[PDB]
């Protein structure tokens, strides 16, 4: 074949977007979890599987406790990642990765050790003919087709911030804060016990996560919807648990992801992510940021709650010289932003010749991932 | 011979089921009664044989009296159990325990002492080759051909509830109520001393088991029955004794099995067996519950009572969400459930490593059935 | 009189600890239970007293089934709770709560509605001119006379855990983690269940309670001690039950406690007391982590085993960088530091105009709770 094709795939923690480069979605997408059997079985002819990995594990979960092996974009467990690269492979894409150079995503100001060892694993592990790591932020604003931006990457590992101009890319200007999807969920378990539900385990703590993915939206303003929170009618909606209980949240519903806006909730200083934008923006040359309060590129899971974008416009405007107008440019599909953005990098001609060659890797050793990429 | 086929044994107390594995049915199954001559014989060339066993008992009842070696899944006399097996092999199925590995059952959260007394006698009675000890709950689920499911098992010993997910087990989830068969005989044979029958001894005891065996069935609503008792039709039935006495029995046959649902009338505080499947349900993962309500299976010999799965359903529904739908299923046949199970599982292959062999008793001694099994 | 006293009242499930605030113990502390006669008595001149409460259950409990009003810091039956609190006011402390502002504890991460209607009961049942809701932790730490400390609140009711530092408080870093005295109650019933002792009932319950309670302690190694469990000497007890039977608990007896260090015996993932120690210091500041590791505080009546200090500072110091010591501090008459801490705070002359005014209540009604404290 022709360009022999090539494969992509997206690990922020908590979802695995994996599929071929050339295509407009990815093949396969399941949650990066490797769950084990904590209950000693007693039957025979069982299994036994050691332990079971993506949606397989949210099949059978109560069995199970699970363990994310990515936490803040930082690899916790390898063999569990490892694990989970195999289940895409083998069990979903049906690939020998000897037959396709792959890309794999990764967040910025991430330690060194997760590009280096990532790198180890893909030629020492799967034996392949070449690979690349690249940065989430840049992917996400190719897919969006634009070439300068602001782009705000938030999945469930860490939050992300990348200003880029004209191309280029501003490395004092990026800036990474510690909130997450995961942090969202945490926050919001504790938040449903003062309502008498208490989710205590990792099994159930999925559930809210799929309550968060749906019910949860972000206030186009916090004080206004929590006073009108009084007169409950909109507000409260009945959620239907796996075991026939019912749940009914409130003004608990929208403060979950108003934690974005308000780090104090969690109990960090760590600016909002609005702020955050602002530190960015800030840093970067004059001349350039009027484009970019015009251009900001939300990527990533933990954007999909319905109205960020507006709040995040009325925060930004709120902050910023009035004398430029500021427009945020927040695809649906964003979700899926990085994954595309690395289609479409695999797919370029000139991209073909900056892979990292397996012979390279093999004269010059896995330190030599910093030296030619980003 | 290839396999050297496999004994199973099911000794809940009341019953000994027992017959090759590899088989649909037992070959044997008789009373686990020692019977004892009480009364001083005058006469020359009679027995004199010291105690009967098994059906033999029946046959000659008015004589002896009874003991029953087991109760509450415990075992109270040793002697008495082993003449019980001695006659089960030599008596019935005229097998040299030597050629076979056996399987016994055994009632969960039981003594320690009762596993490993009963393989040291075994091993140290009847010579044999291995044997295992496994849980009756578990065996019935297999019986069942189910993977998953939560198995009410009330035999005549105890009542018993094992929850079971894809395999696996949950040990705190299980429990077990003091109630079973020999208990509803206790309170009946007392119910009907109301009606001026009065049954004393325990020859006229197992008559009255034999009624219950038959004439007694659960109430559709408890109430609704006894109030139709005021015009009494079709709740009488006669019933003949072995002595041409006959018994008219009206309200007072419904009422024995409804002590399952109100132990208060026995005078326990211990649940209803209803509640106690929520108890069971209810320590178990949020997440597997919704199979376990539909998946419930009834074995053992006290849940053969006509209208007990239908009982259970509205009383289940009824306190469940019913928003998920529960199926209980309980098959005809039931009674022989552990024992089915129990052939089935000896049949399996792989299981024939789990043995516990005589060899390996015998450097590690009795204390290894736990080490090893559940 | 000047300042009029007050009056404090510990109510975590499982005991009322209640007496004057001004005072260095309590006047009354008797279990929270409401026993109902459940066996219809027959005679004349009885009561009849619909139900008892206190440590008169106690005395007449045979009779009675028990209920425990609170379940896990949660009331589960309000009437029962007031039937509690008349007790304490009315037949011990002799008191009108009109003449007394009072105090009540509560546990962290609780339902809104329990304080709410906690204060709702104190305003519209025992008319009172004040009262406060107060965190379980915080006033331990006072009691303990220290300023900075990490609280390991476990009573009967449920765990908590509360960092605090030069006062403050760290929402954030708060943990509940549910496991207590109860459901160590609920697992040694389970455990005894091997070695023939069988425990079926609420009132026998109070009985292992009561074996708990001295009996039990917490090994400095489990495995050392289960190990040495094989030459039975001195971890056999002999126990006399009041009906004066004898029983007789080996290695059964420190395997309960070891349960809040492995809560998989339980068959919950939710990880050991020490680990949960871990996960509040770790969501705390890095600066004053040194002041927790070295100031941990432990309260409430499920820390009374012997050797648990011990097993948390190995266990801590274990986990924990060795570069800084860990100091535990334990008091005895811990069990009664919430109360004492409460005692502290209503002396306290500041205090005295924080409390909530009936006036206040009157005027903003029963939401202010969460308002105005903390
Ligand atoms: N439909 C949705 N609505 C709101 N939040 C969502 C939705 N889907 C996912 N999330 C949140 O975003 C997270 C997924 O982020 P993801 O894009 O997988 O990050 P990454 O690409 O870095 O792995 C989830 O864990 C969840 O918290
Ligand atoms: N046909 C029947 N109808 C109703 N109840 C029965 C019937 N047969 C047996 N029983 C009750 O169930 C008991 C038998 O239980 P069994 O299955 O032998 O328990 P196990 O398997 O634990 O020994 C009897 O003692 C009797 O009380
Ligand atoms: N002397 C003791 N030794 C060991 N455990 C005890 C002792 N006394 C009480 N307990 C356990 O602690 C529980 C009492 O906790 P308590 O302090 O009343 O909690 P709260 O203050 O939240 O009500 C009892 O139910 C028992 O399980
Ligand atoms: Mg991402
Ligand atoms: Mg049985
Ligand atoms: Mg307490």
């Known amino acids: 074949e022709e360009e022999i094709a090539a494969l992509v795939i997206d690990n922020g923690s908590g979802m695995c977007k994996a599929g071929f480069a050339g295509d407009d979605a990815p093949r396969a997408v399941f949650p990066s979890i490797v769950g084990r059997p904590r209950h000693q079985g007693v039957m025979v002819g069982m299994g036994q599987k050691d332990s079971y990995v993506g949606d397989e594990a949210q099949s059978k979960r109560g069995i199970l406790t699970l363990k994310y092996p990515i936490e803040h974009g930082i690899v916790t467990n390898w063999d569990d990642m490892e694990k989970i690269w195999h289940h895409t492979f083998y069990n979903e894409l049906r690939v020998a990765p000897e037959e396709h150079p792959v890309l794999l995503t990764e967040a910025p100001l991430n330690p060194k050790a997760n590009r280096e060892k990532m790198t180890q694993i893909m030629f020492e592990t799967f034996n392949t003919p070449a690979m690349y790591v690249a940065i989430q932020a840049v992917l996400s604003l190719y897919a969006s087709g634009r070439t300068t931006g602001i782009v705000m990457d938030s999945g469930d590992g860490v939050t992300h911030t990348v200003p880029i101009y004209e191309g280029y890319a501003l490395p004092h200007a990026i800036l990474r804060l510690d909130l997450a999807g995961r942090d969202l969920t945490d926050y ?43 007169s409950s009618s909109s507000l409260e909606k009945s959620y239907e648990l ?90 649906p599909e964003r979700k899926y932003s990085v994954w595309i953005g690395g289609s479409i990098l695999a797919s370029l001609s000139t991209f073909q010749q900056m892979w990292i060659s397996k012979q390279e890797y093999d004269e010059s050793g896995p330190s030599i991932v910093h030296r030619k990429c980003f």
């Open 188 to 230: 919001l378990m504790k938040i449903l016990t003062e309502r008498g539900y208490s989710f205590t385990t990792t099994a159930e703590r999925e559930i809210v996560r799929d309550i968060k993915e749906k019910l949860c939206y972000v206030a186009l303003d916090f004080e206004q919807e929590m006073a009108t929170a009084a």
């Open 242 to 331: 796996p075991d026939g209980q019912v749940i009914t949240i409130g003004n608990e519903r929208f403060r979950c992801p108003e934690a974005l806006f308000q780090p104090s909730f969690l109990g960090m200083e760590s600016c909002g992510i609005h702020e955050t934008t602002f530190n960015s923006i800030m840093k970067c040359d004059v001349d350039i940021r009027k484009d970019l309060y015009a251009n900001t590129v939300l990527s990533g899971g933990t954007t999909m709650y319905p109205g960020i974008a507006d709040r995040m416009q009325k925060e930004i405007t709120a902050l910023a010289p009035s004398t430029m107008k500021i427009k945020i440019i927040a695809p």
